[PDB]
């Protein structure tokens, strides 16, 4: 941000861009290095009632695998066939 | 006599520490922070430390990462081909003493089992700035050398 106007013009012309609008060095636009203290929120289990752990216990809802066949009609695929991707409307071609 | 030997020592020390050409053994992640030390923010070249030197033109080996048993012979071979004076900088926990992999069956527990080490840079990885501090510490070690004074007193 200290370059003379002539040097600013010279490097803008050489690069073909307006470099001064997007300098790769940081100045005053960066956030202060001292901030006010946070006050973070608490999660959904932070309740004084209607909050028994056995109703929100993910680990204990896990089950052993379902055995569908053990060595002790239409054809199917493992899932429906994948749908064709659509060409980008933002910019289909580079 | 004393004055000439001292001044000559200062001269050769200044030349050697002002022109430290490293061979970097970029073994693992510590090699990334070494690249950042060469990158513009720190620009190790501005200290006379060229970016990449050939092993036969090198004055300091930087061991930047985990030294495995499979790799250990090759690292020693490069060290032995270095022309003197030669120094070794151990970078990061892995090279310092095995680090996170200290108890592995395949890892050398510190590169100082293979080569003599001049400077140990701690961290996993050390920051590029920490490594630069270490390189400057090596420069100060070289500034303390008194090879000619000891030669004169033999």
């Amino acid at each position: 941000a200290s370059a003379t106007r002539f040097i600013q013009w010279l490097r803008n012309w050489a690069s073909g861009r307006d470099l001064q609008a997007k300098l790769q060095l940081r100045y005053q636009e960066i956030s202060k290095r001292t901030q006010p203290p946070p006050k973070l929120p608490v999660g959904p289990s932070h309740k004084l009632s209607n909050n028994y752990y056995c109703t929100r216990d993910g680990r204990r809802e896990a089950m052993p695998p379902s055995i569908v066949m053990s060595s002790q009609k239409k054809a199917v695929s493992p899932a429906p066939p994948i749908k064709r991707w659509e060409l980008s409307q933002d910019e289909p071609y580079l | 006599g004393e004055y000439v030997v001292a001044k000559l020592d200062d001269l050769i020390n200044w030349a050697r520490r002002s022109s430290l050409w490293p061979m970097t053994f970029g073994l693992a992640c510590c090699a990334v922070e070494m690249m950042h030390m060469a990158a513009p923010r720190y620009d190790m070249d501005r200290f006379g430390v060229v970016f990449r030197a050939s092993p036969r033109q090198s004055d300091v080996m930087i061991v930047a990462g985990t030294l495995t048993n499979k790799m250990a012979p090759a690292l020693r071979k490069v060290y032995d081909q270095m022309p003197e004076p030669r120094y070794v900088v151990s970078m990061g926990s892995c090279a310092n003493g095995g680090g996170y992999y200290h108890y592995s069956y395949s890892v050398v527990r510190g590169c100082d089992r293979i080569v003599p080490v001049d400077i140990y840079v701690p961290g996993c990885p050390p920051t590029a700035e920490a490594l630069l501090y270490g390189i400057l510490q090596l420069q100060k070690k070289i500034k303390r050398e008194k090879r000619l004074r000891i030669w004169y007193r033999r």
């Binding site: 100045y27 290095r33 | 510490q137």
Partner: protein, 145 residues
């Protein structure tokens, strides 16, 4: 012309460092002849400067003292010479210097900062801090086989 204003900016740095000798002193000690605002000085002689028109990272710097703890540091400066209260400011861990936000005082905090002591007689040497675990039986001091 602009090149004229640049040249006078260079000259001002000579007088900004108290003449030619001070200008050359900072040029050879620190390879930098910028003039900044003096933020403060610590008990060891290090001086701290700021210039917020410089890009982030160059806006704060320290000119190390020429002598610390009995060591000549005119040429041999070290990053570990910055005491902790200024360490936070110089690394942009905070915005305000210890001259404006002094640290909390404790009786056990070192009054005298020490730089890296590796390679000196003051270097740290590790040792086991625990006492002997097994006590050997000591035979009697009189003959009696």
């Amino acid at each position: 012309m602009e090149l004229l204003q640049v040249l006078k900016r260079g000259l001002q740095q000579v007088s900004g460092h108290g003449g030619l000798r001070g200008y050359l002193r900072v040029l050879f000690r620190a390879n930098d002849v910028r003039v900044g605002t003096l933020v403060g000085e610590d008990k060891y002689g290090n001086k701290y400067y700021e210039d917020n028109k410089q890009f982030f990272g160059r806006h704060r710097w320290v000119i190390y003292t020429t002598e610390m703890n009995g060591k000549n540091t005119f040429w041999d400066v070290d990053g570990s010479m910055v005491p902790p209260e200024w360490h936070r400011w110089l690394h942009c861990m905070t915005d305000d210097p210890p001259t404006v936000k002094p640290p909390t005082a404790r009786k056990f905090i070192w009054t005298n900062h020490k730089f890296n002591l590796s390679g000196t007689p003051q270097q740290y040497v590790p040792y086991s801090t625990t006492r002997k675990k097994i006590q050997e039986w000591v035979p009697p001091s009189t003959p009696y086989k």
